[PDB]
């Protein structure tokens, strides 16, 4: 199967809601060493967001059950299942993070792509942070913050304030502050600034992006509204 | 480890929407050899309906894409379809093995026998949906034979309002309509099962009236769809 076949197959898998297949295809494409097209990058991101999302969702449900009880053996069952899920989740994150460090970030020749992958690095470390305990955690949280922060700096220097990828980074980075570092004040300030900068430079919207820009601008507001209530 | 641990784990898996795990747990329970309780039977059925249902759904999507196209593209869709079919068959064969080796042998009561024979019909029906040519006539027959034995027992041992009896009628009617492409037999079976149930409304019970009337409405829904 050549690069074109794998992408066709990944698109089939997506149609069939078989995201593990989808991930497998796009991992192979990534491993062929060349910089990914926007289409391929989105396919990779979607595959893995879904794959990891299933575990995140499962983990929250089991974690909630675990702590809500009770029979010290029923708790021990829930705890052991949680751990099985965490192991799956970590393997998935490590799989993506390996891909980022070995192929995607090194080959990102342009600022937009660099921001995209650095943000993705932030996200997958954030998924690890959601699930990490104790000695490991401070270090995982830092890795997340460091990746977001490099992305943020580049985005602020090299990208217009309405660029979807820049606004998406603001959204996610704000979420990092609120959920992982438990700093709502910093989260609000970042989200608000990114929004404010966008409305101030509305004349920068492009034909390719105006829909995605305004959508993500509204997601920022949604989060601000939720957070300031 | 122990039957209790497995069932607890299956219930967690269900909560987590991790049906492959759920199936695996209930397969181990089943393989311990003892007759399943109602709770365990529902857990087993749910796990496997979900596991197989994901493949059925995938298969329809890929199959529909395959037919709606070129070439090489169709060669890719066809090879993926086949990958999915192989998964689907393994799942069905896993359940059918379980039925033949454990569940049907151990069925002490008519209700349980009807339920597992119905389930046998269903999994053969899932195989038939996906079977081509020489294999198919034989898989279709296996399905019909299992439904038919279930139907017989249900008519001898079970009231016409019993949810499991009505469920069997629904599925068996569906077999006639979708696999054997015989709408008249499908309508007649569904109509009869419905009519016999309203005729013996006297028999609806505290435990079951909700499931009975629900499935009765599903029968009507199918009849309405089919006679339009």
């Amino acid at each position: 199967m050549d690069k074109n076949e794998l992408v066709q197959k990944a698109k089939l898998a997506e149609q069939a809601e078989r995201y593990d297949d989808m991930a497998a295809c796009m991992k192979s494409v990534t491993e062929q060493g060349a910089e990914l097209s926007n289409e391929e990058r989105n396919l990779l991101s979607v595959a893995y967001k879904n794959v990891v999302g299933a575990r995140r969702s499962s983990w929250r449900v089991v974690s909630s059950i675990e702590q809500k009880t009770g029979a010290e053996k029923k708790q021990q069952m829930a705890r052991e299942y949680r751990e099985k899920i965490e192991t799956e989740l970590r393997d998935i994150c490590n799989d993506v993070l390996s891909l980022l460090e070995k192929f995607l970030i090194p080959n990102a020749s342009q600022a937009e792509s660099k921001v995209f992958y650095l943000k993705m690095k932030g996200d997958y470390y954030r998924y690890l942070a959601e699930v990490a305990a104790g000695d490991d955690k401070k270090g995982i949280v830092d890795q997340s913050q460091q990746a977001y922060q490099e992305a943020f700096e580049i985005s602020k220097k090299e990208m217009q304030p309405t660029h979807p990828i820049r606004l998406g980074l603001a959204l996610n980075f704000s979420v990092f502050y609120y959920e992982i570092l438990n700093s709502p004040e910093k989260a609000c300030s970042l989200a608000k600034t990114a929004f404010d900068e966008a409305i101030a430079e509305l004349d920068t919207l492009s034909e390719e992006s105006y829909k995605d820009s305004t959508l993500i601008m509204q997601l920022l507001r949604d989060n601000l509204t939720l957070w300031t209530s | 480890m122990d039957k209790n641990e497995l069932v607890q784990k299956a219930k967690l898996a269900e909560q987590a929407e991790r049906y492959d795990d759920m199936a695996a747990c209930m397969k181990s329970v089943t393989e311990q050899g003892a007759e399943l309780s109602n709770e365990e039977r529902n857990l087993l059925s749910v796990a496997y309906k979900n596991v197989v249902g994901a493949r059925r759904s995938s298969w329809r999507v890929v199959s529909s894409i395959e037919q709606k196209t070129a070439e090489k593209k169709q060669q890719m869709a066809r090879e993926y379809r086949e990958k999915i079919e192989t998964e689907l068959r393994d799942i069905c064969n896993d359940v059918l093995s379980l039925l033949e080796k454990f569940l049907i042998p151990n069925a002490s009561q008519a209700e349980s026998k009807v339920f597992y024979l119905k389930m046998k019909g269903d999994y053969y029906r899932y195989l038939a949906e996906v079977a081509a040519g020489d294999d198919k006539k034989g898989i279709v027959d296996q399905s019909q034979q299992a439904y038919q034995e279930a139907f017989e027992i249900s008519k001898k041992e079970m009231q016409p309002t019993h949810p499991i009896r009505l469920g069997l009628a629904l599925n068996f009617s569906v077999f006639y309509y979708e696999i054997l492409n015989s709408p008249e037999k499908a309508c007649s079976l569904a109509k009869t099962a419905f009519d016999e149930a309203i005729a013996e409304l006297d028999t609806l019970s505290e435990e079951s009236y909700k499931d009975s009337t629900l499935i009765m409405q599903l029968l009507r829904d199918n009849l309405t769809l089919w006679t339009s």
Binding site: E14, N42, S45, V46, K49, N50, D123, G168, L171, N172, V175, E179, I216, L219, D222, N223, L226 | S45, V46, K49, N50, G53, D122, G167, L170, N171, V174, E178, I215, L218, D221, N222, L225
Partner: peptide, 19 residues
């Protein structure tokens, strides 16, 4: 869907659109 017998929060991060 075959009409056979049926078988009886979030973070607020970037929604990943599906195409």
């Amino acid at each position: 869907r075959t009409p056979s017998l049926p078988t009886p929060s979030k973070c607020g991060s970037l929604g990943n659109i599906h195409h």
